[PDB]
Amino acid sequence: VLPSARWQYCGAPDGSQRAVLVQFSNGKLQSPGNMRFTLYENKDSTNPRKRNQRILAAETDRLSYVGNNFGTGALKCNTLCRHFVGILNKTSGQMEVYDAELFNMQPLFSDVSVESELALESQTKTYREKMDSCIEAFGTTKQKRALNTRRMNR
Amino acid sequence: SSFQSDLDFCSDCGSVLPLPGAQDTVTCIRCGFNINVRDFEGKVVKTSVVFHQLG
Amino acid sequence: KSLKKQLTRVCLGEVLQKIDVQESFCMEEKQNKFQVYQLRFQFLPHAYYQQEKCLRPEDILRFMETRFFKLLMESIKKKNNKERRVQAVREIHPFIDDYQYDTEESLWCQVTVKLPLMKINFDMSSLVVSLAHGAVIYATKGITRCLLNETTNNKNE
Amino acid sequence: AHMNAKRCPHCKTGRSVVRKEHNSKLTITFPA
Amino acid sequence: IAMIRPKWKTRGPGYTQYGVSMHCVREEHSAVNMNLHYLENGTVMLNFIYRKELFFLPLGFALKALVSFSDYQIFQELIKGKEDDSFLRNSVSQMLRIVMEEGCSTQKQVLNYLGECFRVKLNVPD
Amino acid sequence: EPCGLMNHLTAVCEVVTQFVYTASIPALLCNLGVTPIDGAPHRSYSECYPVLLDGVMVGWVDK
Amino acid sequence: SCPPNFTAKPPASESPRFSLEALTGPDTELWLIQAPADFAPECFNGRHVPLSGSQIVKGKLAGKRHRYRVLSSCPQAGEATLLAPSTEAG
Amino acid sequence: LRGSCLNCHMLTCPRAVIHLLLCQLRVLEVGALQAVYELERILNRFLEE
Ligand SMILES: [Zn+2]
Ligand SMILES: [Zn+2]
C-alpha cells in the first residue's frame, strides 16, 4: 500500500475534549440550518458512574432534538466499540487521533396526561369487555372474530 | 433546517405520512409539518420479473 | 403431429420472457391525480416454441389485446370495490391511457394502466405476474398436454 | 331444495328467519 | 425457524402459508412459542400464545411498543438487507401506518392501547 | 408404530447441560470484525451477515 | 401548535470551549476510526496506519499486540457527522 | 319451522311441489317405481296448461 499516515494520539483524556458525532432518527441532514447544538453534562464529576453521562440538544427553527449518552436511547456501539476522529494533514502525514462520542438524536415533543383520569369506560361489564380482546387487535382467530360479532346475530 | 429520508415518512420527526388525499399538502399528524404533494412525482419504482432467460 | 401441437395447453408465462412494471406518481390536474403504471411485456422468439406449441407471435399479441387486458382490468376492479388496433385496445376501459406494440415483428407490447389514488394499496406487479401465470392463451378444455411418442404394439404391428 | 325460508304466498308477509343455536335454542325475528 | 405450513392459511383473512416460528426459553424455566405470519399484502401478524390461547397482533404495534424509536428508524431496520425491493418498502410503511391510523403516535400510546385491549384475558390487579 | 419416532443417541453423542456466562462474547466479536448493531457496517447490508449469539442479534459482518 | 424547545435538565449543565477547531480547508480531512473497546490508542504513535486495503499494524499491549488488521474503506454515507466547536463563538 | 309461515301455518313451498311429492310417495308405497316420472310428466303439462 502506497498511502499511509503517522499516528499521533493527541488530546488529553477528558469528557468534552472528546469530539462528538451526531446521528438523527428521522433522516440525514443534507443542510445544517441554524441548528443550535448544545451539550450538557452532569454536575457531579467525582463518582465514576454519574460522570461521563451527557445529553446533546439541537434546536431547529421548527422542531427540537435530544440525544443521551446513557440509559434507554444510547447506542451499543459506544460500549462494544470505541470511536475516534482522525484529523489527517496531507502534507505532514500526521493522523491526530481524538476520542469520539456518537449520539442518536430523537425529536422532542410535549407529554400527554389526559387519559390518566379518563380510565372508566363502561367498567360495569367484565366479560362483555372481553370483546376488546376479540377484535382486530389481539384477535383470537378468524372464527372468534367473525363469530363473536353480535353473537352470530342470534 | 430540513432532512433527507424516505418520502413516505416525515423528514422532521420520522413519523409515517398518511396517504395523499384530495388536497395538495400532506400534513404530518405528530409534528404538524406540510409535505408538498408534488414531491411524490419523483418516484419511479421500475421493477422487473423474468420468466424465462433468453439463452 | 399438428394434433399434438394443437392439443397441448399453452400458458401466458410459457411465452413471456419478462415483465417490466414502471410505476410513477403523476398529478397532472390540480384536483385529480393518478398512479401511472406501465407494463412492458416481453416475449420469447417463436423459434423457442415451434417444437411444442403452434403459436405465431401475432396470435400472442392478439390474445394480449383481447383477453388479458380484460382480465387485468377485471382484477383491479375486483381489488377496488371494498393505429386502429391501439384505439381498439384503449377503448376497453376508461383508465387505460396508452398502448404500444411492436408493429414490425411483435415480440413486445406496452400499456399504461393509470389507476386513481385509492385508499387501499395493492401490488400491481403481483397482480400482473399472478395473472400472467394464471392466463391460458388457448387450450382444449380439460386437456393439459398430449404425447404421441409411444410406439407400443399389440400383436407385433 | 324446497324447505327454505321464503315469503309466504298466502298472507304475504316477509320471511321470518328462524335460526338454530347450539342444538338447544330456536330464535325467530319478527318481520317488517 | 422459517417454515411453510398450509394450515396457517386457514387462520386469518389473507394469511399465507409462510411464517417464522420461534421457541423462546428463559434460563430453562420458561418457554413461549410465537409465530410471525405473512399476509398477502406484505403485512406481518405476530402470533403469541398466553395460557394456551392464541392472540394475533399486527407487527407495528409490537415493534412500536418495544422501542422509543421513530417510525423511520423502525423502517430502516426492516428493509435493512433488501433496500431496493419496493414491495417490501410499501409493505413496511403500511405496517407502520396501521398503528398511526389508530391514534398511537408514541410508545406510551401503543402501550396504553395494548394494555386496554389485553387486560381481561391477562388479569392484572385493577 | 414407534418406528422412526423413538430414536436413540449414538454412543459419542451428548447433550449440552452446562450453563456459562456469555457476557464477554459480544465484546469479543466486536474486537473481531463484527460491527455493533447500532453502528454503520461500513459496507452494504446486502453484502453482510446477521450475527446471532443465543437469540441475541449482535451485529453485522463484512462477508 | 408550538415547538417544544427545551433546556429542562435539573442535575445537568453545559460545557466550555476547548482546543478542537472548526477550521476546514483543502489541507486536512476527516477519518472515522472505529477501534476495539480494550484498545489503547496511545500505542500506535511510532507506527504507520494504511489508508487503503489492509495492514497488520504493530502495537504495544503488555508484551506485544502487533496482530492488528487495520482496514480502510470508502465512506458508506454514514450519518455520523462531526460537530466542531465554533471559531466565532466559544 | 324454517320453511313454513308462522302466521297462517302453511308450508311456503309452491303447491305443485307438495302435491307432486305427495303423489310420488303414495305411488312408492306400493313399489310402483315406474310412475314417479309419469306423475312428473303429468304435472309439467298440467302447469303448462
Ligand atoms: Zn412529522
Ligand atoms: Zn302465511
UniProtKB/Swiss-Prot annotation, chain A:
The modification Phosphoserine is found at residue 31. The chain holds residues 5 to 158 of 419 of the full protein. It comes from the Eukaryota. It is found in: Nucleus, Nucleolus. In normal conditions, deacetylated by SIRT7, promoting the association of RNA polymerase I with the rDNA promoter region and coding region. In response to stress, SIRT7 is released from nucleoli leading to hyperacetylation of POLR1E/PAF53 and decreased association of RNA polymerase I with the rDNA promoter region. Coiled coil: none annotated. Component of RNA polymerase I (Pol I), a DNA-dependent RNA polymerase which synthesizes ribosomal RNA precursors using the four ribonucleoside triphosphates as substrates. Appears to be involved in the formation of the initiation complex at the promoter by mediating the interaction between Pol I and UBTF/UBF. This is DNA-directed RNA polymerase I subunit RPA49. Component of the RNA polymerase I (Pol I) complex consisting of 13 subunits: a ten-subunit catalytic core composed of POLR1A/RPA1, POLR1B/RPA2, POLR1C/RPAC1, POLR1D/RPAC2, POLR1H/RPA12, POLR2E/RPABC1, POLR2F/RPABC2, POLR2H/RPABC3, POLR2K/RPABC4 and POLR2L/RPABC5; a mobile stalk subunit POLR1F/RPA43 protruding from the core and additional subunits homologous to general transcription factors POLR1E/RPA49 and POLR1G/RPA34. Forms a heterodimer with POLR1G/RPA34. Interacts with POLR1G. Also binds UBTF/UBF. Interacts with PWP1.
UniProtKB/Swiss-Prot annotation, chain B:
Component of the RNA polymerase I (Pol I) complex consisting of 13 subunits: a ten-subunit catalytic core composed of POLR1A/RPA1, POLR1B/RPA2, POLR1C/RPAC1, POLR1D/RPAC2, POLR1H/RPA12, POLR2E/RPABC1, POLR2F/RPABC2, POLR2H/RPABC3, POLR2K/RPABC4 and POLR2L/RPABC5; a mobile stalk subunit POLR1F/RPA43 protruding from the core and additional subunits homologous to general transcription factors POLR1E/RPA49 and POLR1G/RPA34. Part of Pol I pre-initiation complex (PIC), in which Pol I core assembles with RRN3 and promoter-bound UTBF and SL1/TIF-IB complex. Belongs to the archaeal RpoM/eukaryotic RPA12/RPB9/RPC11 RNA polymerase family. Core component of RNA polymerase I (Pol I), a DNA-dependent RNA polymerase which synthesizes ribosomal RNA precursors using the four ribonucleoside triphosphates as substrates. Can mediate Pol I proofreading of the nascent RNA transcript. Anchors into the Pol I active site to monitor transcription fidelity and cleave mis-incorporated 5'-ribonucleotides. It comes from Homo sapiens (Human). It is found in: Nucleus, Nucleolus. This is DNA-directed RNA polymerase I subunit RPA12. The lineage of its organism: Eukaryota, Metazoa, Chordata, Craniata, Vertebrata. A zinc finger (C4-type) spans 10-31. The chain holds residues 11 to 65 of 126 of the full protein. The gene is POLR1H. Zn(2+) 1 binds at residues 10, 13, 28, 31.
From Swiss-Prot, chain F:
It is found in: Nucleus, Nucleolus; Chromosome. It comes from the Eukaryota. Belongs to the RNA polymerase beta chain family. Catalytic core component of RNA polymerase I (Pol I), a DNA-dependent RNA polymerase which synthesizes ribosomal RNA precursors using the four ribonucleoside triphosphates as substrates. Transcribes 47S pre-rRNAs from multicopy rRNA gene clusters, giving rise to 5.8S, 18S and 28S ribosomal RNAs. Pol I-mediated transcription cycle proceeds through transcription initiation, transcription elongation and transcription termination stages. It is linked to Treacher Collins syndrome 4: A form of Treacher Collins syndrome, a disorder of craniofacial development. Treacher Collins syndrome is characterized by a combination of bilateral downward slanting of the palpebral fissures, colobomas of the lower eyelids with a paucity of eyelashes medial to the defect, hypoplasia of the facial bones, cleft palate, malformation of the external ears, atresia of the external auditory canals, and bilateral conductive hearing loss. TCS4 inheritance pattern is autosomal dominant. The active site comprises the fork loops, the loops and the rudder that stabilize the transcription bubble and assist polymerase translocation. This is DNA-directed RNA polymerase I subunit RPA2. It comes from Homo sapiens. The gene is POLR1B.
UniProtKB/Swiss-Prot annotation, chain H:
Zn(2+) 2 binds at residues 5, 8. It is found in: Nucleus, Nucleolus; Chromosome. Catalytic core component of RNA polymerase I (Pol I), a DNA-dependent RNA polymerase which synthesizes ribosomal RNA precursors using the four ribonucleoside triphosphates as substrates. Transcribes 47S pre-rRNAs from multicopy rRNA gene clusters, giving rise to 5.8S, 18S and 28S ribosomal RNAs. Pol I-mediated transcription cycle proceeds through transcription initiation, transcription elongation and transcription termination stages. The clamps form the DNA-binding cleft. The bridging helix crosses the cleft near the catalytic site and is thought to promote polymerase translocation by acting as a ratchet that moves the DNA-RNA hybrid through the active site. Belongs to the RNA polymerase beta' chain family. This is DNA-directed RNA polymerase I subunit RPA1. It comes from Homo sapiens. The lineage of its organism: Eukaryota, Metazoa, Chordata, Craniata, Vertebrata. The chain holds residues 100 to 148 of 1720 of the full protein.
